[PDB]
Design an enzyme around this catalytic site. Structure first.
Site, PDB file in Angstrom:
ATOM      1  N   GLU A  77      43.697   1.253 -25.075  1.00  0.00           N
ATOM      2  CA  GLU A  77      43.706   0.153 -24.123  1.00  0.00           C
ATOM      3  C   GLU A  77      44.909  -0.776 -24.236  1.00  0.00           C
ATOM      4  O   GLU A  77      45.349  -1.161 -25.316  1.00  0.00           O
ATOM      5  CB  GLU A  77      42.462  -0.735 -24.255  1.00  0.00           C
ATOM      6  CG  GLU A  77      41.209  -0.079 -23.751  1.00  0.00           C
ATOM      7  CD  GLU A  77      41.053  -0.083 -22.254  1.00  0.00           C
ATOM      8  OE1 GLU A  77      39.897   0.034 -21.772  1.00  0.00           O
ATOM      9  OE2 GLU A  77      42.102  -0.249 -21.586  1.00  0.00           O
TER      10      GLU A  77
ATOM     11  N   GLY B  52      35.810 -13.258 -29.595  1.00  0.00           N
ATOM     12  CA  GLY B  52      36.247 -12.084 -28.893  1.00  0.00           C
ATOM     13  C   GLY B  52      37.259 -11.233 -29.646  1.00  0.00           C
ATOM     14  O   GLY B  52      37.461 -10.054 -29.323  1.00  0.00           O
TER      15      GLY B  52
ATOM     16  N   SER C 283      36.614 -10.873 -32.939  1.00  0.00           N
ATOM     17  CA  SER C 283      35.709 -10.394 -33.973  1.00  0.00           C
ATOM     18  C   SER C 283      35.717  -8.884 -34.124  1.00  0.00           C
ATOM     19  O   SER C 283      35.665  -8.191 -33.117  1.00  0.00           O
ATOM     20  CB  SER C 283      34.293 -10.809 -33.588  1.00  0.00           C
ATOM     21  OG  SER C 283      34.123 -12.221 -33.662  1.00  0.00           O
ATOM     22  N   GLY C 284      35.746  -8.443 -35.355  1.00  0.00           N
ATOM     23  CA  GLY C 284      35.691  -7.039 -35.701  1.00  0.00           C
ATOM     24  C   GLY C 284      37.046  -6.377 -35.696  1.00  0.00           C
ATOM     25  O   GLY C 284      37.160  -5.244 -36.127  1.00  0.00           O
TER      26      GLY C 284
ATOM     27  N   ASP D 225      30.481  -8.648 -43.973  1.00  0.00           N
ATOM     28  CA  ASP D 225      30.614  -8.533 -42.544  1.00  0.00           C
ATOM     29  C   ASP D 225      31.483  -7.331 -42.136  1.00  0.00           C
ATOM     30  O   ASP D 225      32.633  -7.447 -41.707  1.00  0.00           O
ATOM     31  CB  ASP D 225      31.190  -9.794 -41.927  1.00  0.00           C
ATOM     32  CG  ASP D 225      31.067  -9.924 -40.420  1.00  0.00           C
ATOM     33  OD1 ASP D 225      30.341  -9.062 -39.842  1.00  0.00           O
ATOM     34  OD2 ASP D 225      31.639 -10.855 -39.814  1.00  0.00           O
TER      35      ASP D 225
ATOM     36  N   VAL E  84      41.903  -2.892 -16.082  1.00  0.00           N
ATOM     37  CA  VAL E  84      42.522  -1.889 -15.239  1.00  0.00           C
ATOM     38  C   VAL E  84      42.624  -0.557 -15.970  1.00  0.00           C
ATOM     39  O   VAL E  84      43.040  -0.501 -17.136  1.00  0.00           O
ATOM     40  CB  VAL E  84      43.947  -2.271 -14.814  1.00  0.00           C
ATOM     41  CG1 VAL E  84      44.577  -1.138 -14.013  1.00  0.00           C
ATOM     42  CG2 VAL E  84      43.856  -3.550 -14.006  1.00  0.00           C
TER      43      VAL E  84
ATOM     44  N   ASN F 157      45.616  -3.303 -20.776  1.00  0.00           N
ATOM     45  CA  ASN F 157      44.878  -4.148 -19.864  1.00  0.00           C
ATOM     46  C   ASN F 157      43.463  -3.645 -19.880  1.00  0.00           C
ATOM     47  O   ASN F 157      43.256  -2.520 -19.397  1.00  0.00           O
ATOM     48  CB  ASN F 157      45.473  -4.036 -18.448  1.00  0.00           C
ATOM     49  CG  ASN F 157      44.815  -5.040 -17.538  1.00  0.00           C
ATOM     50  OD1 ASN F 157      43.629  -5.336 -17.576  1.00  0.00           O
ATOM     51  ND2 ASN F 157      45.676  -5.623 -16.659  1.00  0.00           N
TER      52      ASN F 157
ATOM     53  N   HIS G  38      28.640  -8.467 -37.547  1.00  0.00           N
ATOM     54  CA  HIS G  38      28.100  -9.408 -36.557  1.00  0.00           C
ATOM     55  C   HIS G  38      28.374  -8.943 -35.140  1.00  0.00           C
ATOM     56  O   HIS G  38      27.835  -9.519 -34.183  1.00  0.00           O
ATOM     57  CB  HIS G  38      28.618 -10.822 -36.799  1.00  0.00           C
ATOM     58  CG  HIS G  38      29.941 -11.248 -36.259  1.00  0.00           C
ATOM     59  ND1 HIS G  38      31.058 -11.281 -37.101  1.00  0.00           N
ATOM     60  CD2 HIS G  38      30.392 -11.694 -35.060  1.00  0.00           C
ATOM     61  CE1 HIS G  38      32.103 -11.703 -36.396  1.00  0.00           C
ATOM     62  NE2 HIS G  38      31.732 -11.962 -35.158  1.00  0.00           N
TER      63      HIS G  38
HETATM   64  N1  LIG Z   1      38.818 -19.529 -36.206  1.00  0.00           N
HETATM   65  C1  LIG Z   1      38.693 -18.068 -36.274  1.00  0.00           C
HETATM   66  N2  LIG Z   1      39.666 -17.395 -36.897  1.00  0.00           N
HETATM   67  C2  LIG Z   1      37.450 -17.412 -35.810  1.00  0.00           C
HETATM   68  C3  LIG Z   1      36.238 -18.100 -35.705  1.00  0.00           C
HETATM   69  C4  LIG Z   1      35.124 -17.432 -35.224  1.00  0.00           C
HETATM   70  C5  LIG Z   1      35.222 -16.096 -34.852  1.00  0.00           C
HETATM   71  C6  LIG Z   1      34.005 -15.315 -34.470  1.00  0.00           C
HETATM   72  N3  LIG Z   1      32.947 -15.444 -35.439  1.00  0.00           N
HETATM   73  C7  LIG Z   1      31.952 -16.366 -35.360  1.00  0.00           C
HETATM   74  O1  LIG Z   1      31.796 -17.035 -34.340  1.00  0.00           O
HETATM   75  C8  LIG Z   1      30.892 -16.263 -36.419  1.00  0.00           C
HETATM   76  C9  LIG Z   1      29.718 -15.395 -35.921  1.00  0.00           C
HETATM   77  C10 LIG Z   1      28.478 -16.174 -36.409  1.00  0.00           C
HETATM   78  C11 LIG Z   1      28.953 -17.636 -36.423  1.00  0.00           C
HETATM   79  N4  LIG Z   1      30.367 -17.565 -36.833  1.00  0.00           N
HETATM   80  C12 LIG Z   1      31.091 -18.600 -37.328  1.00  0.00           C
HETATM   81  O2  LIG Z   1      32.320 -18.563 -37.237  1.00  0.00           O
HETATM   82  C13 LIG Z   1      30.517 -20.016 -37.360  1.00  0.00           C
HETATM   83  N5  LIG Z   1      31.533 -20.987 -37.818  1.00  0.00           N
HETATM   84  C14 LIG Z   1      31.303 -21.449 -39.171  1.00  0.00           C
HETATM   85  C15 LIG Z   1      30.032 -22.300 -39.317  1.00  0.00           C
HETATM   86  C16 LIG Z   1      30.285 -23.242 -40.515  1.00  0.00           C
HETATM   87  C17 LIG Z   1      31.757 -23.062 -40.946  1.00  0.00           C
HETATM   88  C18 LIG Z   1      32.437 -22.303 -39.766  1.00  0.00           C
HETATM   89  C19 LIG Z   1      36.423 -15.420 -34.957  1.00  0.00           C
HETATM   90  C20 LIG Z   1      37.547 -16.075 -35.438  1.00  0.00           C
HETATM   91 CA   LIG Z   2      42.861  -0.216 -19.424  1.00  0.00          CA
END
Ligand SMILES: N=C(N)c1ccc(CNC(=O)[C@@H]2CCCN2C(=O)CNC2CCCC2)cc1
Ligand SMILES: [Ca+2]
Length: 223
Positions: free
Chosen positions: A52, A175, A177-178, A84, A57, A54, A40
């Protein structure tokens, strides 16, 4: 990361930042030319930022390398977030050093209660938004199969696990994510999804990397 702590510079040397003129996702270095992140997190124009702390900077130790290939799992589903996972090949090999280092892939899946390290530059607030300059860290356990499914019924596939804290307050967030979930020195998870951040009874959901080790090797070997 909500409820975490400042890691300290270059204490997580496999952590990378995916950059498109701003930090948008994390990832993990798994050899000098390849990064593991979330499907995603796909977009065109990714620059991988290694070394990385900071992110706002230039401190020294950074390596900025464009992605040459971004390979999303062919069975990724953007609605359920099953599979994912994405592999990124770097245009040039990274120079590996104490500050820029690969993380091992698992030899086996981790069990419920395993303590892991989750890290990232995502949101630090459970309500509203605040984004950090330095890398943040959270120690979190893997939850049981049943607790995970009872929290998110009909939404957890065999390619997902939950980790975190049902009482709220401590979690990954947008933020992050991944980015990595590292348990005993192995990359076991990828930050994937959840309902809100750090909410009671709504733990984080992570891509189950041990199900992908062969796919990763097979795909890197042919690319
Ligand atoms: N609470 C966390 N650990 C966490 C939650 C979200 C993220 C980033 N990922 C997201 O935002 C992803 C991308 C597409 C929609 N999505 C979801 O998290 C949407 N949330 C779901 C919908 C129904 C049950 C919970 C990263 C971490
Ligand atoms: Ca830096």
């Amino acid at each position: 990361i909500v409820g975490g702590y400042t890691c300290g510079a270059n204490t997580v040397p496999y952590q990378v930042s995916l950059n498109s003129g701003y930090h948008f996702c994390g990832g993990s270095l798994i050899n000098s030319q390849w990064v593991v992140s979330a499907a995603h997190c796909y977009k065109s124009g990714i620059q991988v930022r290694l070394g990385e702390d900071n992110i706002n900077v230039v401190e020294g130790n950074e390596q900025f390398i464009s992605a040459s290939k971004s390979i999303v799992h062919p069975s990724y589903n953007s609605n359920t977030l099953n599979n994912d996972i994405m592999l990124i090949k770097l245009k040039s090999a990274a120079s590996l050093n104490s500050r820029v280092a690969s993380i091992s892939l698992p030899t086996s899946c981790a069990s419920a209660g395993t303590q892991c390290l989750i890290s990232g530059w995502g949101n630090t607030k459970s309500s509203g938004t605040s984004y950090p300059d330095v890398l943040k860290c959270l120690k979190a356990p893997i939850l049981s199969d049943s607790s995970c499914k009872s929290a998110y019924p009909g939404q957890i596939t065999s390619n997902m696990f939950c980790a975190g804290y049902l009482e709220g307050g401590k979690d990954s967030c947008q933020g992050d994510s991944g980015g990595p979930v590292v348990c005993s020195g192995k990359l076991q998870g990828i930050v994937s999804w959840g309902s809100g951040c750090a909410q009671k009874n709504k733990p984080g959901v992570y891509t189950k990397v041990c199900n992908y080790v062969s796919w990763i090797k097979q795909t890197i070997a042919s690319n």
